[PDB]
Nucleic acid binder design. Structure first.
Lengths: 198, 151, 47
DNA sequence: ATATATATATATATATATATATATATATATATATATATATATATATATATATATATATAT
DNA sequence: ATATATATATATATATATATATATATATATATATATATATATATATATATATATATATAT
């Protein structure tokens, strides 16, 4: 395993020098750019038409003229927005096709990083543990090549659902507790969100 | 009635599967597919640890705030009792607290955690596990159940 | 939602200045430190 | 014979000095971002020439 | 009526010039990391003083 240890610092040396997201997080002006980009792509998923994107960007940057601690465009915010879009295309943060710009997966990872930093709704939730419980149950029942094991699994599960059917025919069914449903649904959302990035 | 129909369709599913299994036609997860299938299982678990680590900080800061407030001279005894009770009730209701409370409720229902650990033990024994993960990850996942208890 | 937009740059300004992980990723010597630390904690979990 | 006071030996704690390591503060070199300047590229203004369709006159 | 040659007008393409914007290269200022130096803190070396238990001599 030590060979991976020796080789690994090459991987991290390369990424810190090369990969877009890490370079972005490194730069002095990272937070402003990340916030603006997140604002843009957040409110639409189809890829912004370039004119609309640059207009919205020139609007956003104007809000941050109050943030005098970093560059403020003194005379023409629209030129500034166009320049920043050019620059972020140059850094492969945003690739545009058909005039509709898109957020490269590198910038997706970059934004997904800073989002998880602050005191937040953490990636995990209460329902995560029940989710993994059910998933382990299913996977174990699958991998088990012994047929009698599958027979017994089916028997116990059918008994469970038969008891539940006896209850339901009597009308005793129970809903997910309304508050528990909140983070239960947030969990399901968190799960699927990964698919997009991969 | 929606739950009734759901139960009916599901019992039909498992009844078909039981008819197959009594004949001996059951099918295993395709060996190569089981590799990424187990790796997904591991990928899910990794989150739990990295947010119990955050729960640690949450409770640490709550306790430190309680102390720094107990210095307050004007706090009557009743005021300090109320602050402890309220700072813990509210803390338990944040998402950190919800995760922690659900895990705690698993402890009362211990048989499910024990079953999860047992199934994990059976899972990593399968030859597919060797390909899916390095030994370190097998070691971690098997004792994830204990590790939550520790944290 | 725009209020969240205005307030958000404060969150990222603070984190880039304060939170440990981001500061680590920023520093020049980050890759060496990160690789070494990963190596250490990787081979054992008890501390 | 038992209890009290003094001398002894042992154990311990303490005092002072030396060296080592940590931490804090200052100065330095270096990397990053910005800005300035040049040149180049893109667009548009102005006008000319060219190119196409048409009509009219001529020849069969 | 057909077919060819000329003139006409309309449309488009092209040429040159002006201005604007982008991009590339160099210089400058600023931030970050390292290193140097001072001082302070931790440990250990050396020896001394003190504290405790014991034993012996004296008094009841």
């Amino acid at each position: 395993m030590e060979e991976n240890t020796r080789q690994r610092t090459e991987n991290y040396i390369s990424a810190k020098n090369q990969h877009p997201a890490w370079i972005l997080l490194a730069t002095r002006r990272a937070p402003l750019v990340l916030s603006a980009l997140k604002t843009l792509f957040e409110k639409s998923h189809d890829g912004i038409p370039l004119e609309e994107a640059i207009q919205s960007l020139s609007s956003i940057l104007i809000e941050h003229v109050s943030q005098e601690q970093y560059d403020i465009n003194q005379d023409n915010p629209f030129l500034q927005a166009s320049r920043e879009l050019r620059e972020w295309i140059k850094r492969r943060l945003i690739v545009e096709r058909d005039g509709r710009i898109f957020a490269t997966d590198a910038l997706e990872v970059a934004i997904t990083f800073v989002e998880s930093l602050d005191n937040r709704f953490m990636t995990s939730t209460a329902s995560r543990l029940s989710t993994v419980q059910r998933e382990i149950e299913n996977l174990e029942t699958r991998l088990n090549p012994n047929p009698a094991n599958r027979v017994a699994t089916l028997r116990r599960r059918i008994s469970e659902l038969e008891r539940e059917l006896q209850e339901a025919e009597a009308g005793h069914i129970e809903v997910l507790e309304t508050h528990q449903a909140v983070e239960h649904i947030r969990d399901v959302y968190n799960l699927a969100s990964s698919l997009r990035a991969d | 009635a929606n739950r009734v129909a759901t139960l009916r369709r599901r019992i039909s599913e498992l009844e078909r599967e039981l008819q197959e299994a009594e004949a001996g036609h059951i099918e295993v997860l395709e060996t190569h597919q089981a590799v990424e299938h187990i790796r997904d299982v591991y990928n899910l678990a990794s989150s739990l640890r990295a947010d119990f680590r955050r729960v640690e900080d949450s409770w640490r800061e709550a306790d430190r705030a309680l102390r720094q407030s107990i210095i307050g001279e004007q706090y009557h005894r009743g005021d300090i009792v109320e602050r402890l009770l309220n700072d813990q009730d509210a803390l338990l209701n944040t998402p950190e607290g919800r995760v922690f409370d659900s895990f705690q409720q698993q402890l009362r229902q211990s048989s499910e955690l024990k079953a999860m650990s047992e199934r994990l033990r059976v899972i990593l024994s399968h030859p597919s596990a060797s390909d899916a993960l390095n030994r370190l990850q097998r070691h971690d996942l098997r004792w994830l159940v204990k590790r939550l208890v520790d944290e």
